[PDB]
Ligand binder design. Structure first.
Ligand SMILES: Nc1nc2c(ncn2[C@@H]2O[C@H](CO)[C@@H](O)[C@H]2OP(=O)(O)O)c(=O)[nH]1
Ligand SMILES: Nc1nc2c(ncn2[C@@H]2O[C@H](CO)[C@@H](O)[C@H]2OP(=O)(O)O)c(=O)[nH]1
Ligand SMILES: Nc1nc2c(ncn2[C@@H]2O[C@H](CO)[C@@H](O)[C@H]2OP(=O)(O)O)c(=O)[nH]1
Ligand SMILES: Nc1nc2c(ncn2[C@@H]2O[C@H](CO)[C@@H](O)[C@H]2OP(=O)(O)O)c(=O)[nH]1
Ligand SMILES: Nc1nc2c(ncn2[C@@H]2O[C@H](CO)[C@@H](O)[C@H]2OP(=O)(O)O)c(=O)[nH]1
Ligand SMILES: [Ca+2]
Ligand SMILES: [Ca+2]
Lengths: 104, 104, 104, 104
């Protein structure tokens, strides 16, 4: 059930998969939403050890279960690549500045 | 104990966290309360060197510990961003022209 | 205090508790009053995030302080469940059509 | 994950690169910060067999991850040259007097 723990937010595999599908679709159509224009390139400044190859893109995953549509993104993100492979689930919660930590 | 001091008001991390959670929930839903429509955009006219990125929003934090729900907001504010990250705690107390100064 | 604000109407916790007790008593007795047969099932078409479980029942709360007894219902309603747990306080004021918005 | 170790402080290549960029920028502008006026010339009294040519300049790298801005410098330093090339990472930790030893 609780496959990904981002701070106090708990996400299942289905939650991640649904958010990822939505994010990948916008990327594919070349569309973006929100003040930060998601989805957009994730450069992996944090140096996470992803098993899948780049380029990576970050997209918000909402604790409410709704698909991100331009409103408040919150602290959590799903990261995917050009093959629509899941790189990882990250969050600002527990990190300083605009840095991320991986959800466990 | 006294994590943030706004004038003579002593706030703990828990106090700030509770205030931020209530304010962020309203922002995320797209709702506001009070004659000044909180939470509202904070443009950073004071130039606080926030570690997190904008857009910023200010939400009242009450000295009594009660969560703001529409009355007089007082002088104290918690500033959070769209990522649900705390930017800072500021106050009108001690600021000329009713602007803001940081809570220490 | 002004614990709930439905449009321009201001309600205290006591006002809500009194109205709730009245509606739950009729529900328990299996009786209704008013043109719309109150209390009756609240389907939650609005999809509000209630902390208590369904089924839900809506019952009018009057600004005058009188307990509803079959007259004009007004725009405000208290929503409770089978265990007499308060789900929320909602209103038609500020909403479009026959919809409801939550009182703050 | 521990590219450079100064005593007990663990530094990634990113930590060092970010520290170097900040220090070089100040040298470029002719500006210095802190009581010891950093960045300043490093004369190589320790006789490190650096791979890049002199002149060398020393600049503090903080274990907290923040960029040095004039406060307490700590024991660690990044050494870079006029071509913006990293010469090495050194520390006072484990050395007597005001001498330096290399971080490995
Ligand atoms: N923290 C972080 N930010 C990244 C990364 N890749 C791109 N960014 C963007 O770089 C800037 C500084 O963090 C922000 O615009 C941030 O976008 P988001 O703010 O949308 O994450 C990354 O790997 N880490
Ligand atoms: N002091 C201050 N007021 C702000 C800031 N951002 C928004 N406001 C004020 O908040 C109020 C509601 O939006 C407005 O009066 C707006 O001021 P201005 O009218 O000067 O823009 C800010 O950064 N500092
Ligand atoms: N000090 C103080 N400022 C207030 C109070 N209520 C509103 N304000 C601020 O005073 C400004 C002018 O009336 C308002 O735009 C609002 O700005 P903020 O929302 O930025 O606090 C209050 O009770 N105390
Ligand atoms: N808006 C709304 N009306 C509901 C809901 N559940 C029941 N109703 C009733 O559905 C019909 C259309 O709104 C009305 O009879 C309304 O009753 P009330 O008018 O008594 O609220 C609900 O979840 N939302
Ligand atoms: N240990 C050491 N100090 C140096 C060197 N180059 C300049 N200095 C400065 O020489 C003095 C004697 O150590 C100190 O003021 C020191 O500055 P820092 O303390 O800033 O390193 C060097 O190569 N080694
Ligand atoms: Ca109290
Ligand atoms: Ca030598």
């Amino acid at each position: 059930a609780c496959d990904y723990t981002c701070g106090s937010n708990c996400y299942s595999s289905s939650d991640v998969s649904t958010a990822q599908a939505a994010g990948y679709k916008l990327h594919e159509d070349g569309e973006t939403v929100g003040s930060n224009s998601y989805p957009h390139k994730y450069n992996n400044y944090e140096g996470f050890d992803f098993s899948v190859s780049s380029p990576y893109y970050e997209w918000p995953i909402l604790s409410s279960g709704d698909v991100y549509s331009g409103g408040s993104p919150g602290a959590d993100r799903v990261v995917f690549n050009e093959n629509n492979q899941l790189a990882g689930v990250i969050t600002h919660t527990g990190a300083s500045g605009n840095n991320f930590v991986e959800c466990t």
